[PDB]
Amino acid sequence: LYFQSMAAPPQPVTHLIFDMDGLLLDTERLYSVVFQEICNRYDKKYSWDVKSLVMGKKALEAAQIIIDVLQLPMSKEELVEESQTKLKEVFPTAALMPGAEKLIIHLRKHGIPFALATSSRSASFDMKTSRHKEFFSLFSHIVLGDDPEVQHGKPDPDIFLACAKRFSPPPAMEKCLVFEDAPNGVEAALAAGMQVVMVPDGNLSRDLTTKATLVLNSLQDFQPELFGLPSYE
């Protein structure tokens, strides 16, 4: 097992937090399919560079940027309406990412506590997980993007602080390990005082991956013994 990089020596952890979108489920592929279908109509390419400019943006804000840079003729409100309508139809087809099932089973076997955090709210969470209820029931608890204790989204640490505090009994933040795909979540994890494993899209510039404790090509390359957890049998 090979890593792409390490920012700092791994410290032992007791509790794990997984971001859902992009890391556990292939939702980024679904966004790209849908935006690409729309852009096709205008002979425009929803490219990696364009995606990168709307990473971490709310839907209206992302829509306005796509419209500007691709010179699309619709309003941001119309693009949001169309894309969210199509995403509602494709979300339930979300697939678990490579290595996710293996790692969760391993954590359950060894009684390692783990939980789920996500920027998605209820409606999208329910659609995206609709065919994976058994897998999602394995997590200790789930914190959604609309959670009462989350005042601010990523890159603010709130989502991961709330997630750590919901464990009974709660650990020290420093004993928690976050799994993320996106730079906004890496920054949030670090600002929460936690270590972070990043599994970024292979197109993401390496300059945006430099802060994460550990960067991997796939969750399949995760070696739990680097953070003081039991190694795979």
Contact with Cl ion (CB under 5 A) among 88, 108, 121, 165: 121
Stretch in the footprint of Cl ion (CB under 5 A) among 9-17, 85-93, 116-124, 225-233: 116-124
- The DSSP call for residue 196 is E
Q: Which helix (DSSP H) or strand (DSSP E) does residue 166 occupy?
A: none
19 among annotated binding-site residues: yes
Known active-site residue 68: no
Q: Is 88 in the site for Cl ion (CB under 5 A)?
A: no
Q: Is 187 in the site for K ion (CB under 5 A)?
A: no
- The DSSP call for residue 14 is S
Three-state DSSP state, 126: helix
Three-state DSSP state, 115: strand
Q: Is 200 in the site for K ion (CB under 5 A)?
A: no
Contact with K ion (CB under 5 A) among 182, 214, 219, 226: 182
Residue nearest to K ion (CB): 22
68 among annotated binding-site residues: no
Site string for Cl ion, 22-51 (x = CB under 5 A): --------------------------x---
Single out the residue of 185, 118, 128 nearest to residue 157, CA to CA: 185
Q: Is 204 in the site for K ion (CB under 5 A)?
A: no
- Return the one option of Cl ion, K ion, none that residue 120 interacts with (CB less than 5 to 8 A, by type): Cl ion
Cα 132 to Cα 127: distance, rounded to the nearest angstrom: 10
Known active-site residue 19: yes
Pick the catalytic residue: 21, 26, 158, 181? 21
Distance in angstroms between the alpha carbons of the first and the last residue of the chain: 14
Count CB neighbours of 157 within 10 A: 20
Burial 92-115 (b: 16+ CB within 10 A, else e): eebeebebbeebbebbeeeebbbb
Give catalytic residues, as residue numbers.
19, 21
Residues that bind Cl ion (CB under 5 A): 48, 58-59, 120-121, 124, 152-153
Question: Residues forming the annotated binding site for Mg(2+)?
Answer: 19, 21
